[PDB]
Structure formats: C-alpha cells, structure tokens
Amino acid sequence: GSAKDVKFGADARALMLQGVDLLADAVAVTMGPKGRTVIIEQSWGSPKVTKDGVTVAKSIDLKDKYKNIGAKLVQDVANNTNEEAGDGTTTATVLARSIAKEGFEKISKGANPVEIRRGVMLAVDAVIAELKKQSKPVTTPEEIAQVATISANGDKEIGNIISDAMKKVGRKGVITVKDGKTLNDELEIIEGMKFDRGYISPYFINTSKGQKCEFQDAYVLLSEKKISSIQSIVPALEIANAHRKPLVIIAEDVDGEALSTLVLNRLKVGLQVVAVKAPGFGDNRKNQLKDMAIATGGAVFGEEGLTLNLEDVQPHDLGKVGEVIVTKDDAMLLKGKGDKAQIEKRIQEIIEQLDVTTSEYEKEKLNERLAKLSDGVAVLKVGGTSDVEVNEKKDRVTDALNATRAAVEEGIVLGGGCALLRCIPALDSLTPANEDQKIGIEIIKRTLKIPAMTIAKNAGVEGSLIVEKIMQSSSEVGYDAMAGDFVNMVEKGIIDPTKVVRTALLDAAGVASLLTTAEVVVTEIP
Amino acid sequence: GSAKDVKFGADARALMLQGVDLLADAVAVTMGPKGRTVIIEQSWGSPKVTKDGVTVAKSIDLKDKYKNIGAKLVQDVANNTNEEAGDGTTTATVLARSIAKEGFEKISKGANPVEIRRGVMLAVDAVIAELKKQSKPVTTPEEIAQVATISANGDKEIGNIISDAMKKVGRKGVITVKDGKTLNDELEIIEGMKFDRGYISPYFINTSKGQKCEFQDAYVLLSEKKISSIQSIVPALEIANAHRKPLVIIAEDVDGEALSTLVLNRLKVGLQVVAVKAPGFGDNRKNQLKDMAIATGGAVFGEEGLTLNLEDVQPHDLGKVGEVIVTKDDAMLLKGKGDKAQIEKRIQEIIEQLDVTTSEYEKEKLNERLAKLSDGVAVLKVGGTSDVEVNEKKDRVTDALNATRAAVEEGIVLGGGCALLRCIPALDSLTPANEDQKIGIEIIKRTLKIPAMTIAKNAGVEGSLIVEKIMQSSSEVGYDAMAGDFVNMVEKGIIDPTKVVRTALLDAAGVASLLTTAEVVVTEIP
C-alpha cells in the first residue's frame, strides 16, 4: 500500500555497493589482533569505544534506503557467519566487499554477470576443497585453549575456562553458558543430560534471544508410545497444573492433533508445556528412555509389558528436572534429581553389560550411554558488574565456545589470513570455460589476500609487502601482528577453525554475487 | 464529495502506460527458471530478496495516481490469472504491457482504437483456438509431477507431494492443503466428502483469505425436503446452541425466509450456522443424502415414508463432522466420524448394486458414490518456522495444486514460451476487414515472442536469436534455460497447463485494450 521507489540495474547496484563500502570500511579497521578503534556515539551516556567488528557492524545504519539495504544484506550475511561458526563477521564483510566491488567493475565494462558468477563460484569451490584438504585436527588441549582465546578476541580467561571445561567433560561433551550473579567467571560440573532431538513445534519458545525455551523445575512426562486419547493427556495436564510445575513431554511423534492442542493451550496465559521426540531409532530409544526415567525419578508410561496407560497418571509416576533448555535441534534436561541409588544401580548394570559382548556398533551406544549417565554438564556462569556487561561477556563466551566446537568437529588452519593464501596455488590448475569465468577466477584470487593485507595494515605495516613475503615464504610460517614478525604460525598459537574460513568465504561469495546480479531494488519513499 | 482531478484521452493513457511499464519492467526480470533478483525493502527488518514475480508485483505501489492506477489495473489482471490458474502472473503482465504499448504507438499515429481492438481480439481468439488444438492430455503421473514442479517455481518437494497425493487419491480426486505445526510437509489421507454445491449466501464466510468458511466439530442438519415451519428450525438451533456445536444445514433451496433468518442471526456474536444447496437434482439427490447421513451419523428428516418432521429434532438424529470448509461453488465436510459398521454395510450395499444392471449413465453415479465413500480426502499439511514462511509455503503449494488441476482438466502445452511460438503460423490464414485489424494482428504476432524472449534474456542469452532458432526448428524441441540448450521440450518436462497460457493471453489482451481505449481517468487530488 505504501508508495515505492523502484530502481533498476547498475543505478541501484551502485548505491548498494556504496552502502557495503561504508559498512566494510567501518568494520575493516577492527580486523586482526591489532584492530583499530571505533567510537560509537551513545544517545544516553558516554560513547562506546570498541575494537570488535560485530559491534561496529551492528552499529551502522545508513540514511539512504539503497545504501542501507546493501549494507543490511552484507551485514546479515556476516551475522549468519558469526552465528553459524562463532567467527568471521569482519572477514566475511571484507571478502564480500572485495568480491562485490571487483565484480561490479568487471561487469560495468560489459561482462556477463552469470558467467562471472559461475567463475567466482567455481573458484570458491576449489578454494574450499583445498582448504579442507589442508586442515588438521585438534590433538591436545593447548590447541583448544589457543582456538578459544583467538575466538574471544585474545581473552586468555575465556580460552582457559573453555579449555578447562573441555578437559573436564570432553571435546565432544556438553558445555553450556548461563549468567552469573558474582564478579568472576566460575566453572561448575552439574548433573544433566542432552540428546539430539529438538522441539517439534517452534511455538513453545519462551526466549527469543536464541530460539530456546527455558524452564525451571519442570515435570517430565515419558510416553514411549503415541498418545492413546485426549482423556490420556488431559489428566497429565491437570496434574501438572495442580502441582504448580510445568510439563516437558517426550514421545514418538506429536505432530497432528496433540501438538495442535498443546499449541492452542500455549496461547493461554500461565500454561507452559513443550514436546520433544524420543531420542533413538530402535533399542537405543528404549534404553535411553529407561535411563532418563531412572535419572529423573518416576515411572515409564506406555510399556509393552507393564501396559501402564497414560490415563492413570499419578504425581509420583512422572519425572522431574531442574532446568529445561530445548532448541530447534537439541534438547537439554538439566539438574534432574532422581533416585541416586537407582542411578548407581543402572550404572552398575550398564558397566556389567559392557563386558558381556561387543558388536562394534552397539558398544559405541553403550559407551555413549555410560558417558551421558557419568559425565556431567559443564556450566560456565558469566559474572560482571551490570546487565550490559554480563550480556556482552555472555555473547563473547558463547561465540568462543561455538568456534571451539567448530574447531573440534572439522579441524584448524593457519590464522591471520594465511589459510586463504595457501589456497591460491590450486587456482592455477583449474581451467575456465570462457573469458568471463577466468575473470571470476582472477576476482577470487585477488581476494584471498584481502584478510592478510587488512590484518597487516591494521598492525601498521604495508600489508602488500607482508603478503608478498608470505607467498614467497614456506607453507608453515606466516606473519604475526602481535609481534610484527614472520613466525611459525602453527605452534605460535595462531590458528582458527576450518569451519569459520569456509563459512566466511561461502557467505561472502553468495552475498557478493547477489549484490552484483540483483536487477531491481524496490524501496519505500522516504 | 472530495475534489477530483480528471484527465482525458492520451494525456491519461500515457501516464497509465508509464505505470504499467514500471510494473512490467520490475516483474519481467523474474521470469523463467533463470529469473533475476528483486530486493524489496522491508520497513521493519531485513530486505526481502525474491525471484518470484507475484511478490514483485504485490510490492510495487507508485506515487503518481495515474501511473499507480495503470499499474493496479495490470496488477489485478495478473492476480486474476494467478487465482484462476495458479500460474501466469508474469506472462500476463509482460503480454499486457507489450500489447498496450504497441497499441498506444499505433493509435498515436492516428488509428482507430475500436478497429485495433477488433483485430487484436480476432488474433487472440485464433491463437487460443490453435492452442486448444495443440494441447495434449496428461497420461502418466510423472507429467503431473513435472507440472507441479514447474508451477511451484522449481520446487521438487511440492511436485513430489502433489504427485503422491494424486497417485493415492486420484487425478480428479479431492486434495486440500492446510497449515501444519511440524517442520516438514506430511501427506495424510483422511476420511471426508466433497460435493459440487456451495453456500447459498456469501454472508457466513468465516475466512476472508479465500472466500471460505471454516468450522471445527460442527453439526450436520439434513432435510431432503424444505423447511416446513419456523418452529421446525428454531428447535434445531436451540439444540445446536445447547450442545456447543455449530450447525451445518443442507436443504433443497433456502433463499426467501429461512436464509434471511440465518443471515440476521449471523450478526449475533458467536452464532454459527451455514446453509448448503442440496447436492443432486434427481435420484442422486435422493441417495447421496442417505450416504451423508450414514457417514456422519444420525437420521434423515423429511422422508416420504418416515414422515420425520423437523420439529421433533433430537441430538442423536443430527449428523456430526470434524471440519466444515465451504466455498462459493463447492463444499467439503471433513472427518465425519460415524458408525463404521453402518458405513461398511452401505459399501456392501453399493457394491452389490454395482453388479445388478448397467445403464451407461447410472453406473457413473454408482462409481462416483463408491469413490466418495472409499477414496479419502488427501490433506497436505504445511509446516515451517514462522507464520510468514508457512503462509508463503501454503500459497505456493495451493497455486501448484491449482495449476496441476488446470493441467489435468484441459491438458498441457510446451513450456518456456514455445506454446505461444507455434501459434504464430495460424495468424497468416486469417484475413482482416481493414488495415487496422491487420495492425492489431501484427501487434499480436509480435507479442507472441515476448515470453520466450524474456525467459532467454533472463538466462543471459540474446533472446531474439533463440526465438529465431525456435521458429526455424521443428515443432517438438524448444530452448531450455536451466541447461541453456535447444532440447526436446516434452520429454524433459518443460510443460505448463494449456489453461494458464489461455488465461494469460485473454487477460493480457483485455487489460491492454482497456488501457489503450479508456478515455477519461478520474483521480483524487493529492
């Protein structure tokens, strides 16, 4: 209904590129360990002085509609990189601006956007392949500490606490980060579990910050079979309502009818309940549900042998947990105080079954169940002096933990933009179909130098000469910005996960192609 | 009572054509499988990046009143093409603009708009005749999948689910699409019925999105005869009100008084009851109501042998259904739970009557009742992560259903704009009355290369040479845009319903004539 202003072709692409140029100029100065300083004017108090690319990026909002939406496009892409891999906002932004500007200048000469995009994406796939083949896995906790410290903007405390948590629980363990009311960060191992199923309907989310649902002292309903009837879930809801506690139900599949009833009941004020799918696809589902029932304390409803009907639900027949955190893909049941003697008996039964037989596939499940029932949940409470400080530190710790998980899962590569510099040689092997694909290959190859050049420039040195030396030098040493010398990157501690570099290059190429190939831009009149 | 600005003749037609030019220029870049990108500025969040022409068209609102109303004219015509055949908004828009601009240029030279319109519609009707001539009837489910997948803008999931639904239920079966709470689309066959009658009065509509009326757990009053007395419908409404369920009545004809009473009680807060014309007119009217009474459950009021008066209405004699969704022309009664033993007995009676005699006109009715009581209603539940996403997905799959129906109702025809490229030869057999009808026929034959040229242009190639090759080549191969090569069109699966092309050409010609012949344009003073 609102009157629009419509711009076509390069007329709109130029303005969008101006917006992305302002964004990338603002966020480029903050890149590296020697990142420059940005002062953001606060409308209520003292100005905010930061060297963080995420804050600088989320800070700017342009007045021009076209510039603002180009900046918003690149900015949301960088946010996606940050939220997916824990790092890469500034790198994705500088790569995106490089690719977009080079593509715009090549297209304005009269080239084909589609062929250039094809060449750019073939180059990107080659680079990602080489960067994956050059990755190395983490083998020692010191590498975990290095990765966490780099991902936390050089914060040694965050790296140390994350490495300690991964030492206590495991590299593939369960670590969570909540707020703390004290003045120093504290590491706590508490009893809890986490399994690879998320909420069926995204309508129970209590918290909009991280697409989570947080509950305190929530009842656990277990039903290994489908809900028999409405008169079988209604008594459980009545019991939960009368017992002043929320409900967390886990079953096979609650999609069509009971899910609709729960969603419509969610609209009621004061009614809280979530649904999660059962963890496994066979005997693992049954034994994991038995483990959860033992750890929570209660009874299992719907068993083939016991034939316990959901209609005859009792307060003592449901599980109990302290804190519930359910996400889109994973669900966390925290502080489940069940029968300790029963938990010990179940542990004894599991360890007795461990030394019975091995099949190379079910023994992995048995070891996993032992780990879930034995290894606690690492909680990293974040302390500070005010709400803003605890929030910012919580975000930094969460992002560092995400980047550490990414390093564990895939591996690590040389930091400081050196990983993308060792990916240049493989662009010689590939051959383009036409001249525009070769133009895209050139665009990408003059782009992998941008992160290292930016980091060196922020260090104060003339980054062109440094990257020339880096390319001339061997494949194990690179340029350090803290010390200002070419050092062996791998053991100096300057390493980042393969995932962040992959995601940054992919996101940058995607948004740059979108910026250089968008034909019509529709904006509301100012 | 508000001051108007009035413009006359070409002075207003020029401005309206400027508006339609901006609309068609913005929506023309998103045409084909290779369609360019429109960045639509959202006022509250990130910009909306889309390649879908219906969204681009919905986005555009001009500031100039005359340009805006020209854009709105072509926009609503394209919307009617969409809502009538589920596909053809961008083609209708580009042909609209082509014909309108060509006729405007031929009329500014001093031609007669009436003679040009006559020639244009002569040409259009010839093209529609040849396009009916070249249609082919779908004969295999893979063609249904191809049609659904094209009509869904290349979504393979929509094509696959629609083909599975039309394999489970049938090509001319009952398929409905409803929202869903889960994260994936699930196909479900649910017991229901649908007949070819719609609500009598368009005042009971609960849903404004689609001229529909949705109910849950509704009563079904049946009276094969007419309502004898008002004291014969007041007790039924009293029972409905006291039994907390919305009545749904089906009589012969309710127009004069009972319908007026129902409409005046509709304005009461919380009163819900709809009337539906009796389904049949002969013996089918006599037996389909028995079928519905057996399905829902209860008794039939007004029989010629049972004399069951409507005054003695009882809660055990009315029908029951789960969902009632009635449209202007058709009505669906979903989840009618009745005596399954009675339904089995009715099916046994029908299959016994099947092998009794054959009349070549009543066997069809027998098999139709067999299918209505046997083939369940396919419901395609649509799930996602946000109300806007589930609404977009619902609209896309609904349009794909409409286009598949349009394909299985009249046939298919070569896609990619080649359908309108093999209708050009027909324009040489006709002969105009005067020179201006020849002018209009030239306009139309020039307009018939515009869809193929637009698709090729969006693919990155020079569409004129491609359409020259298509007209020089044989009558079975056309130009692909995903693979960028001349390929036999029918085998790969580039086919669209002949109805969408027919409707697009008719709609485009109508709005173009209305734009090049309107003489006075009255607009509110800004």
Place this chain on the structure above:
Amino acid sequence: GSAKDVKFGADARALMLQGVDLLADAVAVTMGPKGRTVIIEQSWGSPKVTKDGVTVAKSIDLKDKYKNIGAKLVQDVANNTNEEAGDGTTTATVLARSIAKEGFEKISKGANPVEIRRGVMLAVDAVIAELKKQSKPVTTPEEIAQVATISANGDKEIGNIISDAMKKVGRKGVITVKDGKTLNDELEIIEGMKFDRGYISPYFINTSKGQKCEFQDAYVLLSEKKISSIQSIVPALEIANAHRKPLVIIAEDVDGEALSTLVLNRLKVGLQVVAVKAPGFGDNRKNQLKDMAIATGGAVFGEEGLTLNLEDVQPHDLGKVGEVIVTKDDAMLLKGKGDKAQIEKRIQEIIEQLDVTTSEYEKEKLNERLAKLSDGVAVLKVGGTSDVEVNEKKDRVTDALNATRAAVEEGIVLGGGCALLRCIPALDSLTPANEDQKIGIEIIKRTLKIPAMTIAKNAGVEGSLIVEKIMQSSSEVGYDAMAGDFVNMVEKGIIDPTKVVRTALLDAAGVASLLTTAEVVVTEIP
C-alpha cells in the same frame, strides 16, 4: 535502527580534538590556587560562579556530535582520575589535550600512530618510575593537614577536620562522611567496624551515587559455613520480615543458588537484604566473626562445637547494627550496640592473649582484631544552609579524604607542577627504537611542563620564564602562586600525593592515544 553518520580518520579526529580543545580551554583557566573564574548559566535561577574545574568540566556539552564525544572522552577520563584519586581532573585534562594536539600535529605530517603511541607509553613509564623514585611518605599530621587543604581547593576547615580525624583514629583508620542538618561541620567518633570484603551481587544497591547500599537498624546474620538448605534461610527471612527490620548476612560464599534467591527477592517492593563474604582466610575469619558476634549481640550459627543449625533461628540469636554501608570491595557496620560487658570481656581476653607469644605474622592480626573493635568510626557530618550546598560540600570533603588516603598510601611529591618538572631528566636516558618513538619522547617531555605553566599563567605571570627558572633551580624549591615567589616547596605546604600525579599522567596518555589513533567515529544524525 537509528540512522548514523560515520566519519573516518583525520576528518573525525580533527573534530574530536576541537571538542577536547574547547573543554580543556574552559577548564584550564581554573587551574592552580590562583584559578580564573567561570560563570555557568543556570536555567532556573542566578548564574553559577565557580573557580573549580570539576564543575566547569561537568558543565560543558557541545552541540556538535564529534566535538561532544571528544569532550566526553576527556571528561570521563578526568572524572576517573578524580574518582580514583580525589584530585587531578584539570591536570589530567590539560595533559590529555597537550598530548593529543601534539600527536595530531606530528601524525598529520605523516608519522605512524602506533610508533608515536609506543614512544609516548615508554616516556610515561619512565616518568612514573621517577615519580615513584622521588616520593616521600607522610611523617606528621601537619602534612596530612597540608594535603587535605590542597585537595579541598584551599579550604582550611576541611583540611583541619580531616587531620583531626586522622589524629583521633589513625592514618589507616575508618573515616566516613555523611550529611547533616547543623550549620557547621562536626566530628564524631562512634562505635563500628569495617572489613575488606564487599557485596557479592551488585543488585542490592540502594544508593546509586557511590555504588553503595545504605541501611538503618538492620539485622545481622552470621554463618561460617554454606547455607544448610533453603529450609534454613526461609525462617531467617521470615524472622527479619516479622521484626520490621532488614537483614545483613555474612557467610563463606553465596554465589550460585541462595544469591539468586536473594536477587529475586530483591525484585519485590518491601524486601531488603544484603550478603557479604567471610572476612578472613583461616583462624582470623573465625575469631573476627566471634568479635562481630560479641559486638552485635546474639549467637553464631554453624559452629563445629555448638552445631547451631540454621533451621532454629530466633530473634535473640541474630546480631544487630545501627547503620550498614556496603560497597564493591568494602563493608561497614555502624552503631552496633551489643553487650558492653561482653565487649569488655572480649577486649580483656584479647589484651591477655597479646602477651602469650608472638610469631611476627599473627601478632599483627591480633592488633587488627583489637583495633577493629577498639578504634571508633570517625564520621564527618556535613551541614549548611540548603540541600545543594551540602551535596557540594560533602563531595569536596569526600574528594579531600580520598586524596589524603592516596597520600598516606604511596607518598607525596612537590606540588605546583614541579613534580612533573623533576621527571624531565628521566627522558634523557631512554633511547628510542626509531624516530617516531623519539617524537613521542619529545611530546611527553614538552608536555611535562604544561601544569606548572598553566598554574603560573593563571597567577598572572608569563609561565614560560617561571618554568625555566624552576628547571634551572635546585631540586627542592619551586614557584609559589599564592605568594608569587620561588619558595622551598616542601615545608611551605605545597605537596600532593604521588598517586594523583601518576593517575593523571596515565589517564591523559591513554585518552590522548585513543583520540589520536581512533579510525572510525559513528554518531547519530542530528
């Protein structure tokens, strides 16, 4: 969401420097004993005539965003100097402007900001080393009076009261400053204690002026162990809310659970409670809690001998104090009227144990234990003629207290600006790495005479010749400005703590580097 203006490099640093120049010019005139006069327009009464630089600084807000944020940066840095040392807002401001202007003029010639900052930091470190090298401690109450009078801008009465309070209590004793209704400042010694542990959660703060929590007639709960259960803190809270009196609890560590419960109880209107950590690291903690229990009157809950479970708390079993002041690192319990006979018995026991054996590390602790109970809190009640001039005078007395504590903590140096003048020979021994670090050394050595020059200029004389005479003169005399002659600076009275000079130089150098090395400045559009 707010649109921003983003400025880069010198095109922003220049405007920020203009802001800091306006701020420093306005606050520089008020520097010294002979400080000039500033009239500040009061928008409700008569203008405010002041010679005090903190009011002038806090009085200045520029209309331009970039200038205002440069001014605000230097303002907050000067405020930090004033709030962590009690004196040095104007000296820090003038040094900061000097360093920033000189760095800006050297960088605009083409220098490297990183290297200039490195030279500046090495120069500042050398200067601070020599400042620590030339500091002398306080040896008589006369010097306490001198430093208090200088830190109160010449007020002989503030110096006198602070010196008398330090004579009565001690140079390392508890002195506090509250408001009062009389017309003349009065000194009172009252019973109370203070220990080096502050609050655990910064959410109980009733006072927002000085991050304090102020209570009147508050109950004291003691527990030298972890809270047994919620079923033992609930009765405590019930007792506290039944006897119409707040609670002050001291424990071992209340961070995770009970702290969260006290914070959520802090969110209800009518509930007040604070928590403090245990005072000691061993036997000192136990005996200090014993002393506090005797001084407050009641019982100790949680001993290994008495085993007084926290589930049997009674009103006679809790301690009582008059006024409670809790800060971030310190806690004060004031007017705790316990059993005077029990306090005398405790004092007799302590003085009897003070003659058994000494160990050179626990006799000190015994002295401290006796002093906590024996030395009374010195409260300096401030009063006058209205509400605003009691806040003003209380701020002045508090800042003078802070500077006297800084003097009795590290030492004193030659006032007037000669302290920074005697540190000039330091900068002749250090050697720079390159020419830009020599530029930084020159900047700092030229900056080291700005305060003396400013004080002399405000006196009425050409300060360049005065500082030349001071540098040519012996290392014990310097220019007086209340007399106008070069006098022996040490026995005349003109001395300031080394901590104010050190903090001012650090703060000036830090904000000046920030100002001359900030690359991007983001402000909202006006």
